[PDB]
User: Fold this.
Amino acid sequence: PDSWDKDVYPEPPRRTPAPAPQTSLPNPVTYLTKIFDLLVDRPVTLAREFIEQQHAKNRYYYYHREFRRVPDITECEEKDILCMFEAEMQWRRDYKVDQEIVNIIQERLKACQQREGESYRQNCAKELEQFTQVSKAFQDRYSDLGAHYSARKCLAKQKQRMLAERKAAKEAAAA
Amino acid sequence: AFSAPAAYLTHQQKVLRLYKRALRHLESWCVHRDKYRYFACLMRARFDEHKNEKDMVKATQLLRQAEEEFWYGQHPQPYIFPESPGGTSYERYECYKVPEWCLDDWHPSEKAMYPDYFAKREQWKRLRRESWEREVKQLQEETPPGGPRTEALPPARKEGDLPPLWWHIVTRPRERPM
Amino acid sequence: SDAPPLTLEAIKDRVLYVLKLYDKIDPEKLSVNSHFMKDLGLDSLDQVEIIMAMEDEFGFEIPDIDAEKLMCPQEIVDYIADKKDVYE
Amino acid sequence: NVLQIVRDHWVHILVPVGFVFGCYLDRRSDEKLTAFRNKSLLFKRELRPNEEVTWK
Amino acid sequence: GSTFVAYLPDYRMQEWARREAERLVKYREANGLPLMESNCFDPNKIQLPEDED
Amino acid sequence: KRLFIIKPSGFYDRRFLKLMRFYILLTGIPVAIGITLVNVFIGEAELADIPEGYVPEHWEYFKHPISR
Amino acid sequence: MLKIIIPTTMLLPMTWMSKHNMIWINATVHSLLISLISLSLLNQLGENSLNFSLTFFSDSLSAPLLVLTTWLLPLMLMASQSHLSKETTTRKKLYITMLILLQLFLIMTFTATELILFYILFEATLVPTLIIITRWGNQTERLNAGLYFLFYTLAGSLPLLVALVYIQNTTGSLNFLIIHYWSHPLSNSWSNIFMWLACIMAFMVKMPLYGLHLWLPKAHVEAPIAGSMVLAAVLLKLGGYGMMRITTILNPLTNYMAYPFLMLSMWGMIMTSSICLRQTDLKSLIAYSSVSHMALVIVAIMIQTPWSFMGATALMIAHGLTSSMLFCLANTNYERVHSRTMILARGLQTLLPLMATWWLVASLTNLALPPSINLIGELFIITASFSWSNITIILMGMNMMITALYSLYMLITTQRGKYTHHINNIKPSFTRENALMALHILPLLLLTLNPKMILGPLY
Ligand SMILES: CCCCCCCCCCCCCCCCC[C@@H](O)O[C@H](CO[C@H](O)CCCCCCCCCCCCCCC)COP(=O)(O)OCC[N+](C)(C)C
Ligand SMILES: CCCCCCCCCCCCCCCCC[C@@H](O)O[C@H](CO[C@H](O)CCCCCCCCCCCCCCC)COP(=O)(O)OCC[N+](C)(C)C
Ligand SMILES: CCCCCCCCCCCC(=O)SCCNC(=O)CCNC(=O)[C@H](O)C(C)(C)COP(=O)(O)O
Assistant:
């Protein structure tokens, strides 16, 4: 349905085979689905139609809240408490959004594994690669901060990683 | 379980107990009835061979060898009656046994049902109450001055007496209460 | 349902039945109040065998301290009745 | 007759009255921390043609 | 109280975070950028010490 | 034949269970009926974009009517 | 947040102005109303706390504790009116006053923005508890217990005070927000080591830590039922809350200063779980159970990870509810038979079936059956410890077995078997006791339904 974007949560084109009977005996599954349809699916559809008719007469809306971008922790003086507070809150919001991104990728991976059946080791390599990249980036960003994490500790971790990478590059250029 | 124990078991009592245990374990070994009867007769002859020993020391020494032989040749998994202290139903119904004094705490609505039963209960309680002073005095009279020496209790001897300490023996819950 | 409500008459009948199949007692000479050592001339081993036969017949064990005291068929019937909560 | 009822059950308004007094004191405390009202970089906003303050 | 707690408004911003993540995933997948970056801060605003020797 | 079965007093446990059920239902059946009525006749808000120049109230950022 | 503080200070004169036979009703009704009011603090944010004023604030870690305290007060009131029936009116009002003052001090402690104010309130909580224990306890050991309860606390807390003022002369502020934002690493020097010890030992002795726990069995055994309830369910969580708060300024010293305390916590958790296996006193068994659970919480706080903090918060809430229920269940039997020996009254399932059901549910929750919040906290802590070091799964696993054993042991000792013959004064369970059990147990599963309310700020 149009409830969720089909780009963020993609799916294959869903090819299914046609019924090709070969036996003269009746298919009990066919009569069972017909009975289930006529006995369950239609009253439920009528109830849902009534509920949606009632909902259509009372239409009100809710909105996604928008947040501006404030200066980061790098643009804050050492003891400026107000800027530190705003940057810290922005960092926490970004951390939550990154967690949800990882959640989306993991849901994609799980759905692929269930969907592809017995070919999942070959037919879901792309989802595994996306999860590998996202997990590596997330681990480099937020791992080992521990309880009492903050934007300052994340910045210190990034600076340490940057120093290590710069030293490695400068010594490799010497080779 | 009903009889008061003694300070010790006599030699004859020990011999009889060993005889019964040997017969039961031999039956556990010999499943079929005819084979069991054959070997039980053999065991009976073996027992009554040394029945007439006037030397008590040699008798107790023979009993010692008998116990050693029984312990070596006992059945590892002897047959136990289901309600015996080793059986599969030993204490199966103990969870259904409720003491009678609990009925004293029933709500009057519960006691509204079964009126005649509670009338009989009142009669029994009155009889116990009347009986208690006499039961205590009889136990006081019949006790040796150096305290009781066994766990046996005297019967009732007077015209309308009751045997002392009878309430909890008479009002046992049941063997199959619920 | 389950087993019928065993009665005193049934217990006495079963005990006398078991005793009358014993080769060492005379069925005519045996009565409900006949003593094992006095009237019937049995020894302690025969009494143990009789107790074991009663145990087999009724399917429950009698402790040795209690079994030592039962000397007449009436006593055996009474012990069984008090053990199994039989009053009629 | 309400005299006895009141003199017996007037202790039942102390806690609700304390609740209302606490709410009022919380509002009084809130009114003394408005130095940054509509001044944060994240929530700074233009006033509506009628409203005077973004929050109380 | 259980009814009140069950219907507490989402002040933890879970649904908002999910929608923000959906937007960002859609954008970065459409334009081919990586889904996440190992750096949470732009290196242009970070000034490393001049000398490492 | 029928005998008397000795049991502890079952009046008080039954009374407590009945009272607890009565009070829980007394306050919870109206709550369930009201929740069902609200769900049926006042559905959830539909997600939409903020129109230009509009500043929504805070409770407008939630979707369920009871939460709002 | 004065909307919660003021109604308790109003509970005070309402109790002191009540008619002689209406104190319990008024106190219970208005305490339940105050709990309903305090229920609104569960609506927390995802980024920062609820900064009500310069003095008080509410966080996702303190709101469940406040709700638990305000919910526990009425339960204490119901559990206390049985054994205080023969008391005079003035002494009953004094007892209720002690309970109300304890609740007020705990409420102000859990929301103080300032560490010295937190110290003052967290130390003020001693006086009502000490008075309750030494005045309304039953046996002559109570006096000694009070002393053991007092100095054990004070010897741990007086150094902390010094450390606190020292910090305020160095950083200039003890406000928690400024302390968090202006945090700086602790160097590796002897002075910093002793400052760490001074900041930690008070909360470690209030947990209590293994080896420092000797006061707890005395205090929880000689106290009245309400005293035991408040000591086990809330007053032990002061140490956990204080450690979670104060650890923000102790990094990275903790990285190696936690080794002796981690070792003590794990081995003493095993030791106290084993001690529970041979206990002739039923109250002491519950006390040592509390010691084991709090050792687990100490490990979780000491390893300093988000999953550990979540599990620790859930475990504190679940342990508070469960231990209070267990103490009340034991007190019912004590009031019936006037003895605390576990093997005295046996086979109580035959005589009290609904009480046996309450016992079964309490024991099942004590051994962390899924999906109870006890299990959620324990499993989160165990996963965090496994990440810390794979070998911990041995010791933790050991504890998981032992707990179950002793838990079921208690049940099998008290409810199953055959009833004692000479005990004939076991009356049917009152509606008050059944209601107490239900009000203890229903919130546990209701929180199981929505577990994110007790998972703390790291959620
Ligand atoms: C006596 C015999 C009993 C047996 C028979 C019983 C008959 C059936 C009754 C049992 C019910 C079965 C449970 C099945 C689950 C249905 C309920 C569930 O769906 O509700 C949850 C809701 O549960 C509540 O959130 C949990 C209740 C809160 C608990 C607070 C306890 C009250 C406070 C008292 C003091 C607390 C002390 C402890 C300190 C913390 C849903 O959570 P959520 O995913 O969100 O909902 C999403 C949709 N919303 C948000 C729009 C609502
Ligand atoms: C009953 C239970 C109560 C609770 C128990 C609480 C546990 C408290 C234990 C304190 C933990 C550690 C304390 C000090 C940290 C290191 C300990 C020491 O052994 O390590 C070496 C210390 O070296 C030597 O051990 C010197 C210390 C020897 C003197 C200490 C006395 C120890 C005796 C133990 C008595 C038991 C104490 C508890 C009494 C109740 C490290 O070498 P060094 O690099 O140089 O010191 C680091 C500090 N620097 C960086 C400033 C230099
Ligand atoms: C299954 C494997 C285990 C096999 C164990 C069995 C093997 C051991 C069999 C041999 C042991 C003996 O005979 S040991 C023989 C012990 N010697 C004596 O007893 C001599 C004195 N006689 C008496 O005491 C009484 O006459 C008494 C005999 C009790 C009769 O009692 P009553 O007349 O008043 O009923």
